[model samples]
Structures are given as C-alpha cells and as structure tokens.
Target: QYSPNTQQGRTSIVHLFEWRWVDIALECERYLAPKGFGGVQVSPPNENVAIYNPFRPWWERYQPVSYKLCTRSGNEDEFRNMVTRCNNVGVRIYVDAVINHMCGNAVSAGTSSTCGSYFNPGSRDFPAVPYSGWDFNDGKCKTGSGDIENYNDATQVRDCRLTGLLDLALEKDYVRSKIAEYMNHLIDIGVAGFRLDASKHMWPGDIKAILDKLHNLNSNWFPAGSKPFIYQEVIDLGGEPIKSSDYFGNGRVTEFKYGAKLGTVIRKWNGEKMSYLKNWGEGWGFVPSDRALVFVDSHDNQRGHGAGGASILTFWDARLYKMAVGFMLAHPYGFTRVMSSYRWPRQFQNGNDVNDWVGPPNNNGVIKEVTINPDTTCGNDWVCEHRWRQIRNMVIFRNVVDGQPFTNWYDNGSNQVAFGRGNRGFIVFNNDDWSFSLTLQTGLPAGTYCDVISGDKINGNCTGIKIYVSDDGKAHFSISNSAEDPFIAIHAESKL
Candidate 1:
C-alpha cells in the first residue's frame, strides 16, 4: 500500500487533525477542492482510550481501545459518509491508523466504546478484535521495566511500551492478521491508506506483512489495482538506534528533519543565511524526495513532543510558521502535508503549563461539532491554517509547479531568497529586512501575473499586487520593507 493517487495536478496534503467528519466532508466541497489540495490526513477514526475526571486530553485518541470505526470525532456512519463525500469532490482521505499498542494501565474493561466494541484493558484484551496477552511482546520484553527507558538500544525502543502503553507483538501471525483486518476494513470503506503511527516502534517486517494483506482501495475513489498510500510516522532525528531507513521498504518515511531544518534556515538573525537551500535536497542529510514525506510541523511536534531538541514552528508563531511552510511549499522537497490544528491557548484557559492537554472545543466532556463561519473560516477553536490565505495560496502554487525543479536561485546577501520552480512558478522571500525594486528572472511567460500570496485571482483579474513580465521573462519586482507579508509568489496559473 504505497501510492497517494492524488488527483492530477493537485499536489499537497493538509492534516485536518481533530476535525469532525461532517465538517471535513463539507470542507472538501467548499474549500479543499477549490484551493486544489491533493488529500487530507484525518485524526485516527478507530475507538480509543477515553481519559476523564478532567478535560479529556487530545492524546487519549493515540491510545486505541479497539478496531471499531468510532471515536470522539464521530460514529462509523459519519466517517463513511465523510469519506464518500470527500472522495466525490476529488479530495482523498488518509486515516491515522494507530496500530502499535493497546490501552494503558488505568483503562476500564467494562467501559464500552462508542462504536459498541467491548474492551478488556487488564488482560491486554480487545474482545471485538479478539486480542489477548499473547498479542503483545511481553515475553521478549520481560526484562528492564517494560517501558522504553533507553533510546540507544534498538531492541528496547522497538520491544518496549511507549509510556506504559501495551506494546503489541506485531511479529506474531495472529497479530498481523488482526491488524490487517482492521486496516482492510477502512480500505473497504473508501479510505485511501494510512499514516502508520509509531512505525519505528513496530518491526518493519511486521508492517511489510500487513501491507501485503491489505485489500486494494475501494474502487469508488481510486482506479483499479491502486495500492494504498502509506506515509509512516517515524521521529528519527539523530542518535536514535532505530533509523527511518529501516522502514523504507514498506512505504514512504516521514522526514522529521525537514521541518526542524526549515525553521533553522528561515529564522535567522543578523546574518546571511538560507543560502544552503540552493543545494537543499539529499545534501542536507535527508532521505531522497521520492522516499520521503515532509512537513513544517506535526500534531506531536506542535505540542512539544518533538525530536532534535528544538521546538517546532506552529500557529502559535504565525509569521515564522507561514514563512517556514511557504518555503517548504516553494522548494521541491518530499511529498508535503500542511498542519491545520485546533487552537490551544497554552497558558490561560487550562492552568499553568497544562493547556496542551485540553482537547478540541468541547462542552461538559463532550466534543462539540465544528462550525464554519460565513466567510468559510473555521470556528470552535480550530486554527484551520490550511484556510489561511498565505498557506492555502501556497498549495495552489505547489500544484501549479508540480513535477518542476528549482532553478534561477537568488539571494540578497543577508536574508532574502528567491527561486523559480522550473518555469512554472516563482517566489521571493524577505524574512525580516525586506524590499525589492530589482529585476528578477521570473522564468514565467511574458505576461501579467497575480501575486497569489497577498490575495488571489478573482473574476479574471488580480486583486493582489500585479506583476508584469518582459519579453525575456524578466520582471522588476518590488516589495515594501514593512509590509504585512514578507514574501511574494506567482505561478503560470496566476497569469491574469
């Protein structure tokens, strides 16, 4: 299960984490399709641990309780409807399949899930899926505390539990079949594939066997014989025993390095930085683009569960986050997924330093349905960065320049950088000290093009800054030093 099978010419994925199924279905019709997003990575739809007695933290969903397609997001019916509606509009759905572990120590066996599955936490049992203690790796992991305490030991990281969660013995034939059946059910329900969670914790061989058993995607959306799309979650920065390369055989590997590295390049102080972007492919110690899936930040990284020590760029830091994501889209990197998150007011609403635990907008422990504002922006605490004009506009640029390479790279000695996407798109950046009245090799046709970053093409004309190209594809681009935006993007599709 490997191909993303994106609609022709559409090229980016947005993580609609924690959004309800009905809201997402509506969004595909009103926003995603019009903006040209390739697909969406949704929250794990399977039934999961329900943390209570306080505000239910979003992390509870990461701890699955059963294979039943029900959770805080919605019931199975809603999920099926959402997938059908989204696929109808050319936006595909990729599920976040959390197959690594079962419930933690504090779970209640009698607590029936929303999807009607009976769970038994004490016995390592999920009766609906029929797993027992035999499904776990406890025998081989009988030593050393059971939970991962050493990152240096590869065996410990793979065999041990993550924060006391039950570690599944993925190597067993029965366990493989159970996991395969769960995933195949989703495939039958029209899911494109999975974002294999904690992939590093499971053996690559185990994942390979599961991928082999998966049925072809439901033909309602994909073409015949299409493999499911798989971009696994592997947090490999450095000094970790388990390398991301280990799972390359199963599907695409998530390049966690790309996000932190992009932040490092753009957020510079009084120095000439970002020049390294000229050779910014595998030379930067990342896996090749074809084998990698990249992002500026992820659900875990945005909330400080990140690797490499440095914190991730998120909606909390709007300006720099956009710049990093913009750069990510501008440069030809791995396949991309943009993060659209629920807004977390990290300090005031919840207590001192516990706001990350607060779940999406909820009422008395129940998740409230999401609402869309009249202007199509999100309400009910969702940040919806994918709808932010700067971010979604970049998605348009990415699609316009799909399959193109970087050329005509430029820099202004200190902070600014400019480059063309083959001959299809061009963008310029002034991270801080920003200005431009200089001529640039735009690599676009000699015509008037709309600068999509500031606004969009409307009614066959430009509402944003207008750029004119000469017969030689040269343009005298100019931007103010103190403008609201610090960048400019134009593509062939932006021609006015």
Candidate 2:
C-alpha cells in the first residue's frame, strides 16, 4: 500500500486532472511513456451528479452518485481500455476514490447523474449502489448541523458530513463491502491504486478496514501479492486536531504543508527564502519523506479550494510555478505529483476568481477533446504543464538521480541556491533580484551537459546553453534574475 508501483527507473506521477479516458490512453503511449512519467492520477472515474446550475463545476465530480465506473471521463469500457493501454506502456493509473461520502444532501436527486443512475440525495437513497439512509452518518454525528463544523474535534470530523455532502458509515461491514467492491472492480481493470479523497473526514481505522478488503494489483501488469498503492488526501497543517501521522498505519498521506511552504518561499512571501530550504522535508515540519505524497498545487487548491495558501503557484504563475516544480523534482524528498490543468475564464473580483467553479473546456456540456498543436503544446485550453521543457526535463532528471543523495548544497544566504544529487544531476536557482555568477562543484563527471531547463539534448547535441564540468567536477554557473526560467538543471542523461 505504501509503494507507488511505478516501473523501475520511473519516479513521478502527473495528475492529469479532469482528463478524459481516451485522451489519457493516447497520452500514455504518445507522451507519458516516452517521457518516462511513471503514472497518472486521473480524476474520479465513477458516477457523479451532473450539476447544471453552476454549469458542471469541477467540484461536481467530487459529489458522487454511485460506485459505477461511468462519468464524463468515459464509460466503464472506455476506462478499462485506457487502463489496459496505459499499463501496457508501464504507465500506471490511480483513481480518485470518493468513498468517504456521496453527493450533497441538498442536491436534487434524479436520473440526471453522469451515468444516468437514479439517486435521491435528500432521502440518502442511491438505488444504483442500493445505499439507503442506514448507510449514512446522520445518527452517528453529534454536531447540531450534522456537518463538520469544528477542526478541533476529530470525532465529528470523521462522523459528520463535509460541507453538505452525505457522510458514509465506513465502519459498517456493508458499506466497506460496497466500497471495496467498487475498488476491486477497478483493480481488476488494471488500476494501480487510489487517491482516497476526503480522507481527513474519514476515520483511520475505517480506511484501514476498507483497504484490507481491496484485491491485490492485477497480475497481468503487477507482480504476485502486490498490494495496491494507497495515498490518502488529508490536509494537516500545524493547528489541526488531526495529524497526518495518525494515518501512517494505513498508507501515505498527502503533505499539504509541502506545497504551502514551497509556495511562500518561491513567491518570496512571509519572509521566506530559497536558501532556507537547505534542510527541507522533515526539517520544515513535514512528515517523513516516504510517507508523504507531495505536489506544488492540486486540482482543488489551484482554484482557491484546498490547503496551499494564497501564494500557491499555479499555471497562472507559469514562471514561478516552473521553478517550484523544478526544485521539487531536483530535490530528493517526498513522492512527487505534478499538476496538469486547463485554462478557464479567470474573472478576478477583488483577488478572487468569481468563475473558479467553471469546469473543463467543453462544448455546451460535453468535454472537448484534447488537441495537440505542432509545437507539442496542448490546444483547446489545456495548459499541459507537464509538457513544458523545464518541467518535462526535470521529470526525467529525477529518474536519472533516483537513489542518489542530496549533496553539493550551496546557497547565497538568500534566494540564490544550487545543489546536486550525488554525481548524477545538478541544478541551480537564481531567485535573487540580481544575477547569479559562481564556480561551484557539481559532483558530476567531467563532461559537457545540456541545461535541460532552457532546451533539450538532441542526438548528441544541446539545443540550448551547455555547461562544462572539469576534472575536479567544478562548473561555472551564471543566470540573471530577469531570465525566463531563472534556473538551470543538468543530469547524466543530458550529457553529451
């Protein structure tokens, strides 16, 4: 449950948030596998309430109607096809499992669900899964509103509804069986694991019980006795009553503080500095590296919904976001997941996107197919940050430096810093408001390597700046603060 189950030599997963199943399949063969991306954290692949008032907001996917593997992403067959295709290329798929609850209690229930499943949210009745009022936590919650109203109280958080969503009685055998049935179906279809959504609102014991019922990974693509990787979404920053460590007994937990702190330092907010990251990870009050699932921003937070604070870097902040992501990939810390988003009409009213609720790019209501431009950038609004030269190269840099130690650490006492992962890879950042010029020991062998941030290495030639490392492994480095990327990275794979 702790392992990501990626193929050997692959190191990271990209959250193709809200991407369609067919498109994901194409991506696995055409891009992800070739680029060495380990896996994809796909959006929920289950039935959800088709919200119309907000015109199919992204959050509607979180409001599940049933466990049926059907949604705007694709039907069950399409999903199975995607899994088979992606897994064939060694790219795993992790589903966003929303088993903590069902659709909002206030939502009108009907056949309007994405899968045409009949559900009555108000009555706590979802005939598709045969769930009823008894399956809910209405009687278990002590809160007056039956919703989580206090972060300091752990019991209510686990037993009460989140927002107005119906809370499931995960402690019950029947509930666990139904949820496990859904997950097992996915495992049989070749999914590697799940991103347990709203885990902070579910009991750790309950989550463990449910997980114990999950089947081993499909033997077609995985080894015998291999357990499905489990990573739960639990936003635990300092003051919260619930700690992320409390759920370590189950599996890895999302380290929300990783992004929050990284964002602040990269954006130069709250008196933070890049040099202060010399002792990152556990030193910065985060959970242990192995037990953390880290990301710069998520589908939730980038839209002003989740834990990363106001400084969270999204694709909207392309320059700074790339630097943060590059630093994450270049550094050895927690398991990393990159965010790939699509552009929406961001109408800001007083520092808030009034249209943050808008869903993916669509025509009327159907999601538009992702199109690839000649330059490899995505068309029809997809940001495809994972395709960016800087980010894509860093993704591979991580693979080359896997199992390497963080050495050759250097900092300019402020925003400027440089580091190397043993002798495999080296990177430098110039976040200071001036140029960075120095001769630093890179720890790599004597050779000329391509600076991956600016461009790629094409057939023994560098398309951009090249760095020379002498016999002693020292290299001259220079970068201006005004440069587009403001960072440079080189690795064994980029050597000429």
Candidate 3:
C-alpha cells in the first residue's frame, strides 16, 4: 500500500551509497530512468557530526548531529535539487533515515554553536534540535549505564543507546514533535520515502507515532494524500528478541533471511546439483511479501558489521553475486533493492575518527574500484556488480514479468536450476564447474527466443545461442563455460 512509484512499470530500487546529490540527479537522468529503475535510496542527508579522526569512515553518517540537510554528500539546497530533479524524471528518492539515536561518543569534544552545545557523553546539549539531557531515556533503559547491552529484551533495546549513541525518548511529546518536524521538513522538500536505519533498536510504537506526525509529501511534486513509503531496517534472523513482526504495524521490514538464503542457494547451486527453488522463500521464515524489503546484501552486513555469517555474497564473489541478483529479479517475492557500492577496502571503517587508519587491503586484498566492462568484468576498484549484463538483463526481465507468478519450476539436485515467470519469461543457471546438456521446460509458445543473458536479438533473430522452444514449451539446451557463469534467460520481448 505504500508503493510510491508511478505506474510506469519499474520495480527495482538501487541504494546509491555515498553518492553526491548532484551526481545522483545526473545519474537519475542519464542512467536510472532510462534503464527502468524505480528509485534510489540515498545515503543519510542529515548533518552529521564531522569527525576527522578515522579519516571519514562511511559510518560517520550514522552519527547524526542535527536534522539540517548538510553532510559530505551535499548541503540542503543540493539535496532538495537532487530530489526535484530525480522526481522530474520519474525516479523517486528514498532517504536513509538514521533517527534511532543521535551522535555517538565523539573522538574529541566540540560543541555546535547552532545546535545546543553537547558534551561528549556526560553533557546533554544539542543546539540544533535544542535537545537536552532530559531528552534521553536513561532511567527506562535496562542496560548497564543505559547502553544497548541486551538484544533479547525489547524494552532495553528500545530505550537504551545503540553503539554508544545518545538515545532519544520518542515517547516524550517534545521529542516526537521535534523528530516529526525534521521528517516533515524533508517531506516538504519532495522526498518519496525513507529507509529507517537501526529500527531494531527503537520501539515500533514510537516509530509509528513519529510516522503519524510526519506531514504528507509536498503537494507541488506529489499527488494529494501521498504518504511517504516506509521500510524499516529490522535485521531478523529468527530467535531475536525484537522480532520483526512487532514492527509490522509501522511499515515494511527488511528481510535479511532472504539474503542468507540466496547466499546458501547460490553456493549450493554452484557446488552441487540441486533444485534452485527448493529453499527459495517462505521456508526460511521471511515476512509476507507485502511486508518485506528484500536484498542479497546491504552496506552493513555485507561488510560483516551487523551479523557475521557464512554464505554471504559480496563483491568478493562477483560471478555468484550476479547470479544471485539475477535470480532475485527473475523470481517474484517482496519489494527488492539492488545494492550499488563504492570500492571500499576490507579494512574500511564506518566512523573515521576511531582508528583513523589509512587505506588497507579489502577482503580480497585488492585496492581498486569496481569496474563495469562490456565484457562483464569489473575493474577500477569499483564493484559495479549491478552493471553485469546478466544482472541488468534480469532487471529488464523483472519489468517484463511484473505481476506474474511462478509457474514452471525445474531444478536438479545440483548444477542446474530453471524456472518460468508466469509464462512471460524463463531462466536457467548452471553453476557447475563443468558444462552439460539437458532438455528443460521453456514455458513459452513455440518460437525462437533470444538468450538475453549472453546475447541480444538482431533483426528478429537472436545474435547468440537461440532457444527454440517446441510447441510443448520444452527446449534442449547446453552450456559449456569453464568460467562457472552458465546462465540463460528468455523473456516475452526482444532481449536487446
């Protein structure tokens, strides 16, 4: 019900992490809209406590000082301009709202003359919001010294500070009104939605209260009665005290289980012959489709910050990453987000003030930006996983197969997995180190289909390997790639 995207048929959003507002607007016009992406989830737009300590770690944005739209990404004017420009091009803007708490322990003591002066930890002063020590919820927190020490206790989780950040008492009317005013300011500037960060640490009721107070989107850019789309970050792995269901009343919850499941399925699909759809969804305790925001990796967990676990897919596994993302787009599940990340080294810190270390080798021990080449390889230290041909094709496939449910599902014990999207599209992935041939269900009318993954159509005929589906929707196919990237996709329209 909170889908703010227009009915032009795009269905995917990309998290453009740490991108400047001016660049975002240019990308929206030059790339996203033309490519059929639904929206962009920008980094935090609020003024963050400037910390020159850890060399400007990305997580410093999580440490907010004031609601003013000022940060490394851009200032308030640039932020509004980016939103308007993107909105003009039919691309919605979703801000990463880190409202669970305020700035954490500063490496150094400094006071913002604009906001109230705040001491490091003992002093309660925020001149910007004018929040004082009384605004914090210390007595209610069950943790030692009011810190978030107990994840199992929901009350403590909500009332206590997260990561040593100053916790706000949302239950207080003054605090709620102030938070609402901040959000309303963004709404008035034409933001389409928000991704609530650290929502697991905040009370769901408190969040709902704040949401209720948020003003509707400015009328100039939005239709009447348009409420901002909300998706809270609730990292649920089952057995957590702060269950995601408790927060469903507020908005959609992040389905982290899907990320782990995809990782498992992809690894298994690559290592052995197994049915791809066996452990797809629902079997893994995912929220209902309507209440879930799904992705294979996020900024936090991808870097091992949230909950470190096995079977995670990051830029480390480029081939598998593409396949996993491609499968996500081809399959019908919840609202989806594609992660676009920078070339961050493995040692990259969130807050740059602590260690204050220089560039260190990434997990891959490489120091380069992920690059996107026409040949499907990335370089330049940029992990442009989203630009992979197979992945991008799947994005287009998702648009064509929208509203369609899964139909012909085929899977082997290992290596081979194939499925049809409501007769609109069919996909197959062969992660086996060796190649093989097999007859598979095409689920399409007898016709020559272009394999969109590897090749495009030329003059009504496919330029690459063509799949000739028989009248019975069956086709014989074979893939022989030593590179371990054996996947094919066919859709309703020309694959170009």
Candidate 4:
C-alpha cells in the first residue's frame, strides 16, 4: 500500500491542481518524464457540481455529483488518452477520489451543468448513482450539534454532515460495491492509484474493504498482481481519538503539519536553528516517513484551506518559498509532492479569501487552455512552480540520489547547513544573514559539479556557480548574505 507504483527510479509527485487532462498528457511527453517525476495527483475526475457561484472555485470539485468520467478537467475520452500517453512516457497519474458524499442540492447551477440531474438538493436523492438516505451514515453530528463543528469528539467526526453535506454509509456492502465499481473503472483505464479525499470522515475498515475489492492495475503500465496504490487524506495530528494510525492498514496518510513545521524552520532559521533538522524524521512528531505523503503546501492550504492556513510558506514569498522548497527536496523525508498551480486573483482585502473562490484564468466563463511558453515556462496564469528551476532540478537531484543514505550532516546552530546523499550528491545552505565559508565533507566522488540550484549544466559545463569535490569527498562551499544564490548543490549527474 505504501508503494506509489512509480517507474523504479523516479521520486516525486507534482500536484498539477486544476490542470486539464490534455495539457497533463503533453506535460508527460515534454517535461515530467524528462525531469524524473514519479506521478501526478490530479483534481477529481468524477463528475461534480458545476459551480457558477464564482465561476468554479477549486473546492467545487469535491462536491461530486456522480461517478461519470467528466468534470471541468475533461471528459472520459480525454482522461483515458492522458493516462495512456503519460504512462507510456513513464509518468503516472493518481486520481483524487471524492467518495465521501455528493454535493448539496442547494448550490444552483445551469441546466446543462454536471450537477443538472434534477434531483432536489438536500433531498439526498442522487439518481445518477441512485443513492438515497439509506446509503448515508446516520449518527449524531458534532457533540449533539447536528453538524460537524467540533474536533473534540471522535464519533462526531466519523458520522456527520461536514458543513451540512450528507455523509455516506460506506460500510454497507452495496455501497462499497458502487464505490469499488468506480475505482475499478479507473484502474482498468490505467490510473496508477488514488488519493481518497475527506477520508477522515469515512470508517477505515470500510475503506480497507473497498481497497481489497479493487482490481489489479492494468498490465500495460504496471507489473502483474500490482495492487492499486492507495493514499488516504487522513489529517491526524495526534491527541485526536481518531488517529491516523487507525488507517495504517489502508495506505499513506497526508502529513499536513509538514509545511507548518518546516516553514518555521526555514523562515525562522536564526532562532529555530538548522541543527534541529539533523534529527528531522520521526523525532519531529511526524508519522513514519514510509507511511507519510508530504508537501510544502497544497491547493487548499496555499489559499488558507483547513489544515495549512495563511501562515505557511507559498510561492507568493518567491525567494523564501524557493528556499523552503529547496530545503524540502534537499532533505530526505516522506514521499514528496510539489504543488504546481495557477496565479490567483487576490479577491480578499486582508488575505486571498476570494482568490480561493475564483477559478484559474478564464476567458469570461471559459477556462483558457494552458499555454506553455518558450524556455518551458507557463503564461496562462499558471503558477508553474514545478517548472521553476530550483524545484525541477531538485527533482533530478532526488532521482540521482535515490535509495542512498544521508551523510555528512552539518549546521551552524543557526540557519547555515550542509549535507550529502551518500556519494551521489552534495548540498549546502547559508540561509542566515551573515556571510560565511566552511569546509564540509561532500561524500561524493572527485569532480567539478554544476550548482544546480543556481543554474544548469550546459554543453558539459555549468551555467551557474561551480563546486570542486576533492577526491576524498571534501569541498569548501561559500555563500554570502548578499549573494544571488543562497544554496549550492552538486550531484554525480551534474559532474562535468
């Protein structure tokens, strides 16, 4: 269940939130495959409420209407084409499955909308799958409040209307079969796996039952007998009676606190100190890395969604964001995911509250097809951070150093730090304001390596800063308080 079913050597998953399937397919051929990405966690592929309220806020995808393969992302045929093309190039797609419950009938939409089933909202009568009240879980919600309002009660959480959306009775064998049928369709069409949304609301045993019923992955893109890779969106932060440990047998759970914790370490480096990172794994209170799926930020949190509020580091902080993300890739941790997004309109006066409500750059109501520019950048309002040099290059660094043990850890008791991944790669950071120089063991073979974080290696030479790793695996790396580059990375693949 921990396996992501990536091509053996690849290492990271990039969440291209709100990206079209056709565009994703092109990305596989042009960028993702060439750059060594493990897979993509795409927006929900199931039919959802067509919200015109803000012309389609991102969350509208979560209020699914049916299991039909259609949404703002694309239709059934487009989805299949993407899966085939992406898999052929060694990039896999992981579908975001929204199985918790369907949308509130109250959210009005155009007659031709995906949610136009004529079923009355709040009636809990969805004829698309024909689920009625009997299919929904019944229990007192949120400490007798009749709605999910408290995190203090475990029972209130597992069986209730989250913000008034009806809950599903997944334990019923028939309900399980319906959801399994939907997932089986995706597996047959070659999806590598799924990210179960709002999984915390569903019973884990019911989920495990559904998983056990899944078909083997399509033989064309996966090994025979490969179980469908499963990762639940269970946001467990300890002390909660309903723990992430409850879902362990299912698959990996999202580690929401990674961003909040790591963000502090980077931005507050002087006070927080980088030395703490030497014991970065489980000691930090994070779940075991093998059972964790982590990211700096996601579609929901970057715009102040539930877990990660505005305090977390996002692309708005540019240099600082890169610094934090660079540290994430540099350090060995959980299975990593990079958030690739579109520029948002700051509709909120204080924060981007309305920004989260608006869809990607649209032509009136039509979502503009993504436009990639020369030099592999995006122009169609896409945040495209994964296309950012530091992020993409780090993906390379991670792939090159795969399965290698971390070594040569060092820090200044402040922000400055350096480390290496076995003998394959070396990285250093001077995140503090004071300029300094230090000799550190690289644990890499002797060679002139391109500083990948600063620039690229072109024509057998580095286009950025350079590092000379002595044959004995020691090198003097320097960074100034005012230097254009605050970090330096040298990998065996970057050797000139």
Q: Which candidate leads the pack in TM-score?
A: 2
User: Regarding TM-score, does 1 or 2 come out ahead?
Assistant: 2
Model 3 Cα RMSD, 1 decimal = 4.4
For TM-score, candidate 3 versus 4, the one ahead is 4
Better of 1 and 4 by TM-score: 4
TM-score of each: 0.95, 0.99, 0.89, 0.96
lDDT of 2 by residue, 136-200 (tens): 99999998998889989999989998998999999999999999999999998899999999999
Global Cα lDDT for candidate 1? 0.83
- The residue pairs in collision within model 2 are none
How many clashes in candidate 1? 0
Question: lDDT (0-100) at residue 383 of candidate 4?
Answer: 80
lDDT of 4 by residue, 35-97 (tens): 899999999888877777767777778887778888777899999999999999999899999
Give the count of colliding residue pairs in each prediction.
0, 0, 26, 3
Please give the CA lDDT of all the candidate structures: 0.83, 0.94, 0.76, 0.83
Off by over 4 Å in 4: 108-112, 138-145, 347-352
List ranges where model 3 is wrong by over 4 Å.
4-6, 111-121, 269-276, 347-380, 458-463, 481-484
Question: What's the distance in Å from true for residue 417, model 2?
Answer: 0.5
TM-score for candidate 1, residues paired by index: 0.95
